[PDB]
Design a protein around this motif. Structure first.
Motif, mmCIF file in Angstrom:
data_model
loop_
_atom_site.group_PDB
_atom_site.id
_atom_site.type_symbol
_atom_site.label_atom_id
_atom_site.label_comp_id
_atom_site.label_asym_id
_atom_site.label_seq_id
_atom_site.Cartn_x
_atom_site.Cartn_y
_atom_site.Cartn_z
ATOM 1 N N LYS A 35 -8.319 1.777 17.580
ATOM 2 C CA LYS A 35 -8.536 1.272 18.926
ATOM 3 C C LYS A 35 -9.227 -0.039 18.820
ATOM 4 O O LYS A 35 -9.513 -0.693 19.812
ATOM 5 N N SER A 36 -9.537 -0.414 17.594
ATOM 6 C CA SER A 36 -10.143 -1.699 17.396
ATOM 7 C C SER A 36 -9.042 -2.738 17.637
ATOM 8 O O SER A 36 -7.842 -2.568 17.350
ATOM 9 N N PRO A 37 -9.404 -3.873 18.155
ATOM 10 C CA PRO A 37 -8.429 -4.931 18.459
ATOM 11 C C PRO A 37 -8.064 -5.892 17.310
ATOM 12 O O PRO A 37 -7.889 -7.067 17.554
ATOM 13 N N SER A 38 -7.977 -5.378 16.092
ATOM 14 C CA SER A 38 -7.763 -6.096 14.819
ATOM 15 C C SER A 38 -6.584 -5.558 14.036
ATOM 16 O O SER A 38 -6.626 -4.423 13.559
ATOM 17 N N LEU A 39 -5.537 -6.323 13.861
ATOM 18 C CA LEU A 39 -4.441 -5.801 13.084
ATOM 19 C C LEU A 39 -4.858 -5.453 11.629
ATOM 20 O O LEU A 39 -4.320 -4.520 10.991
ATOM 21 N N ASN A 40 -5.785 -6.234 11.065
ATOM 22 C CA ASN A 40 -6.182 -5.942 9.708
ATOM 23 C C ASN A 40 -6.828 -4.561 9.578
ATOM 24 O O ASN A 40 -6.630 -3.860 8.606
ATOM 25 N N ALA A 41 -7.626 -4.192 10.572
ATOM 26 C CA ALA A 41 -8.206 -2.888 10.507
ATOM 27 C C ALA A 41 -7.092 -1.844 10.609
ATOM 28 O O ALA A 41 -7.090 -0.807 9.911
ATOM 29 N N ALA A 42 -6.100 -2.085 11.493
ATOM 30 C CA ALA A 42 -5.027 -1.132 11.614
ATOM 31 C C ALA A 42 -4.301 -0.968 10.262
ATOM 32 O O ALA A 42 -3.998 0.186 9.805
ATOM 33 N N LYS A 43 -4.055 -2.097 9.563
ATOM 34 C CA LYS A 43 -3.375 -1.980 8.283
ATOM 35 C C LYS A 43 -4.180 -1.224 7.280
ATOM 36 O O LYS A 43 -3.665 -0.431 6.470
ATOM 37 N N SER A 44 -5.467 -1.425 7.394
ATOM 38 C CA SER A 44 -6.361 -0.764 6.467
ATOM 39 C C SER A 44 -6.369 0.751 6.644
ATOM 40 O O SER A 44 -6.340 1.553 5.666
ATOM 41 N N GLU A 45 -6.359 1.149 7.905
ATOM 42 C CA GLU A 45 -6.339 2.573 8.152
ATOM 43 C C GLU A 45 -5.024 3.186 7.626
ATOM 44 O O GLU A 45 -4.946 4.289 7.045
ATOM 45 N N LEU A 46 -3.941 2.444 7.899
ATOM 46 C CA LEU A 46 -2.634 2.879 7.528
ATOM 47 C C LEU A 46 -2.559 3.125 6.012
ATOM 48 O O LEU A 46 -2.146 4.195 5.539
ATOM 49 N N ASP A 47 -2.933 2.099 5.258
ATOM 50 C CA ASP A 47 -2.939 2.174 3.774
ATOM 51 C C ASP A 47 -3.710 3.397 3.316
ATOM 52 O O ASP A 47 -3.308 4.117 2.415
ATOM 53 N N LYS A 48 -4.873 3.598 3.971
ATOM 54 C CA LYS A 48 -5.687 4.749 3.672
ATOM 55 C C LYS A 48 -4.924 6.049 3.910
ATOM 56 O O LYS A 48 -4.887 6.995 3.138
ATOM 57 N N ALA A 49 -4.293 6.100 5.045
ATOM 58 C CA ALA A 49 -3.555 7.255 5.467
ATOM 59 C C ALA A 49 -2.421 7.526 4.509
ATOM 60 O O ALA A 49 -2.317 8.598 3.929
ATOM 61 N N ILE A 50 -1.610 6.520 4.299
ATOM 62 C CA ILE A 50 -0.422 6.581 3.484
ATOM 63 C C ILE A 50 -0.709 6.717 2.022
ATOM 64 O O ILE A 50 0.028 7.392 1.291
ATOM 65 N N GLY A 51 -1.788 6.082 1.613
ATOM 66 C CA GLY A 51 -2.128 6.200 0.231
ATOM 67 C C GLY A 51 -1.699 4.995 -0.602
ATOM 68 O O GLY A 51 -1.916 5.010 -1.827
ATOM 69 N N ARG A 52 -1.084 3.969 0.022
ATOM 70 C CA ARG A 52 -0.638 2.776 -0.702
ATOM 71 C C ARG A 52 -0.771 1.520 0.155
ATOM 72 O O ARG A 52 -1.160 1.610 1.318
ATOM 73 N N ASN A 53 -0.424 0.357 -0.435
ATOM 74 C CA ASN A 53 -0.459 -0.914 0.296
ATOM 75 C C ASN A 53 0.893 -1.011 0.964
ATOM 76 O O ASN A 53 1.882 -1.219 0.296
ATOM 77 N N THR A 54 0.982 -0.855 2.202
ATOM 78 C CA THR A 54 2.278 -0.707 2.880
ATOM 79 C C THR A 54 2.632 -2.000 3.618
ATOM 80 O O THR A 54 3.783 -2.204 4.033
ATOM 81 N N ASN A 55 1.646 -2.954 3.715
ATOM 82 C CA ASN A 55 1.810 -4.195 4.433
ATOM 83 C C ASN A 55 2.203 -3.950 5.890
ATOM 84 O O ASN A 55 2.839 -4.820 6.511
ATOM 85 N N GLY A 56 1.824 -2.763 6.443
ATOM 86 C CA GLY A 56 2.145 -2.454 7.840
ATOM 87 C C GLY A 56 3.576 -1.973 8.138
ATOM 88 O O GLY A 56 4.056 -1.969 9.300
#
Length: 162
Positions: A35-56
């Motif tokens: 809910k943060s207004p930062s795409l970088n944070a969103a990518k970071s969460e995603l990578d964490k979730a997914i387990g890899r560098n997914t580049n979004g």
């Protein structure tokens, strides 16, 4: 029809991070990233979730995995919530789906806040409940989705999804 089909219809599927109508970041089948207004944070969460560098950008398989986990979490949360459980357990299979749909969209807490509606569902006052479910922020935020879910509580059938 089931909960999984119902949600896929309502949330859609997108492989790259996008914003919902409220401005929040999600991906896949409605998996909230931040809910943060930062795409970088969103990518970071995603990578964490997914387990890899997914580049979004995730795959469909990856999307499904998250989707299953999310629905599981929703059920589990209902089941351990003092205010959600009895209601849930009072419901038929169709209406249980509708309750999980709300929880998926808003969280255990947000749903636990529809005090009135929840009381009415428990008493099987379908029409009544339907009116109260409409007097909400939720309904103004995503009216078409909300109508569908409301009708399902109202009718106990999947007509709204046809």
């Amino acid at each position: 029809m089931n909960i999984f089909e119902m949600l896929r219809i309502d949330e859609g599927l997108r492989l790259k991070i996008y914003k919902d109508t409220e401005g929040y970041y999600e991906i896949g089948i409605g998996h909230l990233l931040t809910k943060s207004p930062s795409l970088n944070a969103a990518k970071s969460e995603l990578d964490k979730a997914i387990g890899r560098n997914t580049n979004g950008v995730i795959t469909k398989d990856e999307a499904e995995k998250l989707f299953n986990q999310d629905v599981d979490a929703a059920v589990r949360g209902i089941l351990r919530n003092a205010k959600l459980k009895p209601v849930y357990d009072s419901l038929d299979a169709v209406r249980r789906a509708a309750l999980i749909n709300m929880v998926f969209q808003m969280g255990e807490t947000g749903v636990a806040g529809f005090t009135n509606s929840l009381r009415m569902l428990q008493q099987k006052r379908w029409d009544e409940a339907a009116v109260n479910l409409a007097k909400s922020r939720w309904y103004n935020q995503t009216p078409n989705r909300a109508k569908r879910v409301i009708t399902t509580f109202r009718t106990g059938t999947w007509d709204a999804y046809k």
